[PDB]
Amino acid sequence: HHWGFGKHNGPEHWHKDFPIAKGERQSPVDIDTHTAKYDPSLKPLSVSYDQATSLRILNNGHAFNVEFDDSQDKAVLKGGPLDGTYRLIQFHFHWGSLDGQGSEHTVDKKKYAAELHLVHWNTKYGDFGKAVQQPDGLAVLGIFLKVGSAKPGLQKVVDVLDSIKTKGKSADFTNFDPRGLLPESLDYWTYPGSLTTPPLLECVTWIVLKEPISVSSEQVLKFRKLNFNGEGEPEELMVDNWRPAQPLKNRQIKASFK
Ligand SMILES: [Zn+2]
Numbered sequence: 001h002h003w004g005f006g007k008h009n010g011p012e013h014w015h016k017d018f019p020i021a022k023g024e025r026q027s028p029v030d031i032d033t034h035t036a037k038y039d040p041s042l043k044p045l046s047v048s049y050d051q052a053t054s055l056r057i058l059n060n061g062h063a064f065n066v067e068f069d070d071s072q073d074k075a076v077l078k079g080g081p082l083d084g085t086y087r088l089i090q091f092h093f094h095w096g097s098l099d100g101q102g103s104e105h106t107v108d109k110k111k112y113a114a115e116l117h118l119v120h121w122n123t124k125y126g127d128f129g130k131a132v133q134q135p136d137g138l139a140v141l142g143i144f145l146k147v148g149s150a151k152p153g154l155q156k157v158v159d160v161l162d163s164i165k166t167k168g169k170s171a172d173f174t175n176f177d178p179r180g181l182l183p184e185s186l187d188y189w190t191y192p193g194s195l196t197t198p199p200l201l202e203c204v205t206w207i208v209l210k211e212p213i214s215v216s217s218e219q220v221l222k223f224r225k226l227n228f229n230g231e232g233e234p235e236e237l238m239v240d241n242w243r244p245a246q247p248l249k250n251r252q253i254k255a256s257f258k
Contacts, residue, residue: 003017003197024249028104028244036253037252042081042256044256045188046079050179054173055067059226064092065090065091065092068088070087077120080190081190081205082139084123086122091119091181095115104142104242104244104245105206112145113146114223115242118142118143118181120141133203136203137203145220146212147214151181151216154180165227166233184211188208190205191254223239
């Protein structure tokens with residue numbers, strides 16, 4: 001009976017195994033755009049993905065992760081609110097059963113169809129497992145997806161999903177360029193928060209881009225054909241793998257733009 005996204009083990013149940021679910025800096029949150037403060041001391045983001053080395057794509061039973069070689073400074077995030085260098089380890093998405101829901105963050109209570117998380121860890125802590133135990137251990141770049149035109153840079157991901165339909169399946173996934181998932185603008189909101197799946201550790205500096213990317217209805221429909229279950233177990237479509245917004249508590253969201 002472990003955590004997931006069904007009726008009996010969904011986000012409202014996670015606090016029984018992970019009491020930090022009711023903590024002081026949980027994610028995601030609603031971004032109230034009129035209450036976020038411009039922070040003119042906020043530097044531009046530096047997204048350095050030209051030497052990124054993707055390795056593999058994995059269905060882990062809650063989402064799929066595209067994993068990267070993070071044993072060297074090959075794909076790094078710097079700047080913005082960050083001190084130091086954060087290395088890309090994986091990206092994944094959250095999405096809905098319908099186009100009207102799927103994002104974890106919301107913007108003035110608006111839900112997007114999906115949300116991309118590019119997860120990075122602070123190299124001063126040496127590895128990901130040490131970084132998640134530190135208040136500044138991770139930096140996650142969040143990008144909203146809306147349905148409209150296709151995103152050409154996503155299609156290589158879409159096309160391998162058939163090979164990782166069920167939990168525990170992986171496939172080689174080299175030479176994928178994550179720069180093809182970024183919008184034109186790097187304007188962002190930032191706040192301190194948490195992982196949005198268990199163990200829900202409060203180790204994340206969130207950087208949420210204001211501009212969404214647009215994917216086609218056919219692209220998101222292929223996400224919804226994945227399965228939460230393992231092969232030869234009853235089929236349960238992988239949809240609605242998003243945590244809803246959590247209370248902001250004693251936090252201020254800052255904006256890089258006015
Ligand atoms: Zn995520």
